[PDB]
Design a binder for this molecule. Structure first.
Ligand code: 6GC
Ligand code: 6GC
Lengths: 208, 208
């Protein structure tokens, strides 16, 4: 039921850098995850133009931010196109390899960690604030999958037995003990207003 | 052979704004066209992972910048995924409508024309420097098409009888008389270094 995969050398090295480098501007993880969600929403919106049945799994195109102080998690939910099992493995493999190489070269040349998104590896900035990331995803052409990594050079993929989401992606950030500010309403509002004010989909910040 | 289409009200209004508003920072058109080319290159690179035959129409993934002082044109060529006839009409229609609305609202609120790309309508910044834009495109699933507009509320689409390009998109900017600086080698190099230094594909500036 649970499949374990080794990250390739470059991605494993990038994840180690993100976890271990001293960098105070951690708030940029939110902008990267929202940007990825917006891109997935653009994809399903575009496909629905030639094929309206693509929206049978859900018409609403939105992003939800769900803080949970009890579980110490910040969840980013979108109703985008979602990812197939192959998409998950390819995005944690071949895509993340070319992106990492180009980004790590720039960091050595004097670039900032905040430019990560320009290299297509923005998702991995989640490890600035999270000790573990769980991704639940559902694409129209596949079953619901759960991807997870606490870094450490590996990730797991399993079919998800949880509540069906219709279509889209849910990124569950298991926050580091010293990073609970990202569970606070005013702090999340501040980051969204600063970095994601022009996203073309409604962003709802859930209250506890 | 030649089909004529009316732009919808919002896009026609955006194109008029771009042509008539006083805005000195025109150089941003290049960044938007290179960004679109990079996105199309990401698309074909991703599709080729599950299907390597997608690269039968060309393996090289690059961007070429071709100035022509005689014809007063700056051409941006890419070997990206290209666009089908439907893609051309949809990108000049439904996609450009939602993007325009969101962008024009921001401009009224105090935003800058330089943020156009965040709204998915970055291509239309070409009209800051061009009096006419011709687009030649070839997608694996369709024939070679020529799209053209001098704004004025309409665009044409025809099957292209020119030289086959294999796969990708060619954007031909017919420059305004006072915008010939964008044909100069040092000026193009300056803009690419400033705004497109981290693009993940080789950018070749052709010499005359
Ligand atoms: C195992 C590594 C993957 C990490 N995750 C979850 C992400 O990057 C990520 C992906 C999507 C997504 N759904 N469908 C789709 O095409 N994308 C996508 C979007 C932008 C770049 C690439 C993408 F695949 C999302 O909505 C939200 C995300 O945070
Ligand atoms: C009639 C209006 C269209 C204007 N043009 C030519 C562009 O926007 C434009 C489009 C592509 C392209 N090829 N394939 C594909 O998917 N794209 C694409 C990329 C980014 C956003 C949307 C896209 F369709 C390109 O390589 C270069 C471009 O300058």
């Amino acid at each position: 039921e649970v499949e374990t995969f080794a990250f390739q050398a470059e991605i494993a090295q990038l994840m180690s850098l993100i976890i271990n480098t001293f960098y105070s501007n951690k708030e940029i993880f939110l902008r990267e995850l929202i940007s990825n969600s917006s891109d997935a929403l653009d994809k399903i919106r575009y496909e629905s133009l030639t094929d309206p049945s693509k929206l049978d799994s859900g018409k609403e195109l939105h992003i939800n931010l769900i803080p949970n102080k009890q579980d110490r998690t910040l969840t980013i939910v979108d109703t985008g196109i979602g990812m197939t099992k192959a998409d998950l493995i390819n995005n944690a493999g071949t895509i993340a390899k070319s992106g990492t190489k180009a980004f790590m070269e720039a960091l050595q040349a004097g670039a900032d960690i905040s430019m990560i998104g320009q290299f297509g590896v923005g998702f991995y900035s989640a490890y600035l604030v999270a000790e573990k990331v769980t991704v639940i995803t559902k694409h129209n052409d596949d079953e619901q999958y759960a991807w997870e990594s606490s870094a450490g050079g590996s990730f797991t993929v399993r079919t998800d037995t949880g509540e069906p989401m219709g279509r889209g992606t849910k990124v569950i950030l298991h926050l580091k003990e010293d990073q609970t500010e990202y569970l606070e309403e005013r702090r999340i509002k501040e980051i969204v207003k600063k970095h994601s004010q022009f996203i073309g989909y409604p962003i709802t910040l859930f209250v506890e």
